[PDB]
């Protein structure tokens, strides 16, 4: 191509959207925004595939242009707006609030949060910058340039912003024994305490993470997010709790739940 691409093919769409094969040639190409193309979940796919409030993508145009949807504290009217990790979708006329947390499989799930929980969100910082007059700058994983932050906050720490004001309230520092949601790679959706940092000058630093059933696993430090100091998370967690039961144990629990229920 001799400029930017404006279409996304249904087949070339990321697997974690769980778009079917047969409905359309094209997938909703996420608009440019805070989250990456292959790490986001467009508003349309949340609004008509996950929750099924719409039937078509013209229904999603009617929902969003009534201004009933409010992603992380501000009303958007774009059907292909990239809503990503830790974002809070507040559908206000229904009186509902959803956090985009990764399920134990790599998808984003329908995680309903309370109106009090929906007022703050947790943001991993990407870099520390010194602005034009000695002004310290954070940049979060969702492109928030927050200036005059606490000096103890360094890269790979998470900060708790209040949506309404956009100012930091608390922060977890990247230290051992802290909870870690894995937000990239094979372990996408795991939750466990950080047990080891392994430095690599030049190459990528890897981080071993012990789980709530002693299931230790590694991950590239790029693909890591700290969700609470020690063993207490600062968010509410979906069922499975990022523990990742095996396919043999999944089969066992699904079979036990079906036979016992009736």
């Amino acid at each position: 191509a001799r400029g930017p691409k404006k279409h996304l093919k249904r087949v070339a769409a990321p697997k974690h959207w769980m778009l079917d094969k047969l409905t359309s040639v094209f997938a909703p190409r996420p608009s440019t925004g805070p989250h990456k193309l292959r790490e986001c979940l467009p508003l349309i796919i949340f609004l008509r595939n996950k929750l099924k409030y719409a039937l078509t993508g013209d229904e999603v145009k009617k929902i969003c242009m009534q201004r009933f949807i409010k992603i992380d504290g501000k009303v958007r009217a774009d059907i292909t707006y990239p809503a990503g990790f830790m974002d809070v979708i507040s559908i206000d006329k229904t009186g509902e609030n959803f956090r985009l947390i990764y399920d134990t499989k790599g998808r984003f799930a329908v995680h309903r949060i309370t109106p009090e929980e929906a007022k703050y969100k947790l943001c991993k910082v990407r870099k520390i910058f010194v602005g034009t007059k000695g002004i310290p700058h954070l940049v979060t994983h969702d492109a928030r340039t927050i200036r005059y932050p606490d000096p103890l906050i360094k890269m790979n720490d998470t900060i708790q912003i209040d949506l309404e004001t956009g100012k930091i309230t608390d922060f977890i520092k990247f230290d051992t024994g802290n909870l870690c949601m894995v937000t990239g790679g094979a372990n996408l959706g795991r939750i466990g305490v950080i047990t080891n940092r392994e430095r690599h000058p030049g190459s990528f630093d890897v981080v071993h993470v012990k789980d709530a059933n002693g299931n230790s696993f590694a991950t590239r430090l790029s693909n890591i997010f700290v969700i609470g100091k020690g063993n207490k998370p600062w968010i509410s967690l979906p069922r499975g709790k990022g523990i990742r039961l095996t396919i043999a144990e999944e089969r066992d629990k699904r079979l036990a739940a079906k036979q016992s229920s009736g």
Binding site: P136, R147, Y148, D150, P151, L152
Partner: protein
């Protein structure tokens, strides 16, 4: 907003500088204990 947030950071940077200056005294106090060891 510029003046208030600059004044708010000035108070927070002063606090962190005084706690990191207490850590300067603490490292000099460790050096004082090893010199009196």
């Amino acid at each position: 907003k510029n003046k208030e947030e600059a004044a708010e950071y000035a108070k927070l940077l002063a606090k962190r500088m005084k706690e990191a200056k207490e850590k300067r005294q603490e490292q000099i106090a460790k050096r004082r204990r090893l010199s009196s060891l």
